[PDB]
Design a protein around this ligand. Structure first.
Ligand SMILES: CC(C)(O)[C@H]1CC[C@H](NC(=O)N2CCc3c(cnn3-c3cccc(F)c3)C2)CC1
Ligand SMILES: CC(C)(O)[C@H]1CC[C@H](NC(=O)N2CCc3c(cnn3-c3cccc(F)c3)C2)CC1
Ligand SMILES: N[C@@H](CCC(=O)N[C@@H](CS)C(=O)NCC(=O)O)C(=O)O
Ligand SMILES: N[C@@H](CCC(=O)N[C@@H](CS)C(=O)NCC(=O)O)C(=O)O
Ligand SMILES: [Mg+2]
Ligand SMILES: [Mg+2]
Ligand code: NA
Ligand code: NA
Lengths: 200, 200
């Protein structure tokens, strides 16, 4: 029968949201298990690699958000059309994920965290937006002629960045249009309405 | 016939070596274009995202080392024999790449670089080695019953780490054994013998 899916993460969009977008789009039912940060140290010790999100599939546990996303979209319409275009999908996702992963989300010294966040957003982020804007050009989606999970991840990552830097895309209307098109996808739009409201 | 392949990176193993292992193992001819730092700015301006490695396939340019590695292994025995195993391969590779990416390879001040290296290798590398040893157990390879490019990436990342921390695997003979098994693969051994000797 249908596989039993259980996703575990904090009560945030964060690194789990790409998986949630994919489930919503593929109309796959799953348990959206959200754990509190105070109970994190105890469940961390029980995970093979001690990091989240994880996805349990019928008694087997998977990890790494992008590895999971690729697994769920393989042979679906969210994956690249050609094998070459699947490379471009992976490459755009990793380009976005490289940048998001540079932010010191877990830094314990608040002043150090603020300094790096501001540096990344004031200098690195505008250059990346310009590279993405040129890459997209006048095309409808980032890769190919139909939406892929790279388009999802662009909307998810740009939403995070816009929390810390609201003027990020003032000069990139085509990147904004792409965000709005992802958000307008019926399954995605429905998830955005009923998902728990969190800062990040 | 065969597609014409051209790889561009610096003269070091670095993030390109995983691609080089895959070409050697698959017995695929390619141009191993190594550039000096001086030739980098002019090439950088031509790349959509300004980063290497890149791989040109019949004159079409791909980027992101792990996106390229996955592309080159699809439909081969290095990719993983099932869909969930391919997910585990991606997961292990990303876990390793996450940790390598934490190191400030491009820090300009040598003192702050050495501090952060020492911190990562002392208080973080042990945890990962024990996680990987436990995940491996008594099995022959990290995923499945045959070698995958995740075993290649383990050997490549552990070679770099061992340069800075020689005692890293003193308590993990099974992880040492996995390195030796990768290094004994005839096509991999041949490449290790022939490649240019660089620190990184
Ligand atoms: C309990 C403890 C140690 O205090 C933690 C520290 C890290 C925090 N963690 C975050 O606050 N977040 C996760 C990363 C993230 C956020 C938003 N986006 N995002 C992200 C998305 C894709 C890729 C990527 F690298 C990062 C927010 C959560 C509390
Ligand atoms: C132009 C400038 C500023 O002078 C740069 C500074 C950083 C150098 N860059 C390195 O020295 N390296 C790249 C990363 C790396 C090395 C060894 N392994 N490795 C690696 C492998 C897999 C994943 C990963 F994240 C990192 C060494 C290249 C010249
Ligand atoms: N690249 C991994 C990153 C995993 C990761 O670092 N998750 C964070 C939460 S966003 C975490 O586990 N924090 C707690 C910890 O490191 O112990 C992925 O995308 O899944
Ligand atoms: N995650 C990317 C990393 C790309 C990257 O940052 N490469 C470095 C060299 S290891 C680079 O491009 N250095 C020169 C520069 O960025 O200007 C990949 O695996 O390809
Ligand atoms: Mg599936
Ligand atoms: Mg990555
Ligand atoms: Na295999
Ligand atoms: Na040791």
């Amino acid at each position: 029968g249908m596989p039993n899916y259980k996703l575990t993460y904090f009560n945030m969009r964060g690194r789990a949201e790409i998986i949630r977008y994919i489930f919503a789009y593929l109309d796959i039912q799953y348990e959206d298990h959200r754990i509190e940060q105070a109970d994190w140290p105890e469940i961390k010790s029980t995970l093979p690699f001690g990091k989240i999100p994880i996805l349990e599939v019928d008694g087997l546990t998977l990890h790494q958000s992008l590895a999971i996303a690729r697994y769920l979209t393989k042979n679906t319409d969210l994956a690249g059309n050609t094998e070459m275009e699947q490379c471009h999908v992976d490459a755009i996702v990793d380009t976005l994920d490289d940048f998001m992963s540079c932010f010191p989300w877990a830094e314990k010294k608040q002043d150090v965290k603020e300094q790096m966040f501001n540096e990344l957003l004031t200098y690195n982020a505008p250059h990346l937006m310009q590279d993405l804007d040129t890459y997209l050009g006048g095309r409808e989606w980032l890769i190919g002629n139909s939406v892929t999970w790279a388009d999802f991840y662009w909307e998810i990552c740009s939403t995070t960045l816009l929390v810390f830097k609201p003027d990020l895309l003032d000069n990139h209307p085509r990147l904004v249009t792409l965000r709005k098109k992802v958000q307008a996808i019926p399954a995605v739009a429905n998830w955005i309405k009923r998902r728990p409201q969190t800062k990040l």
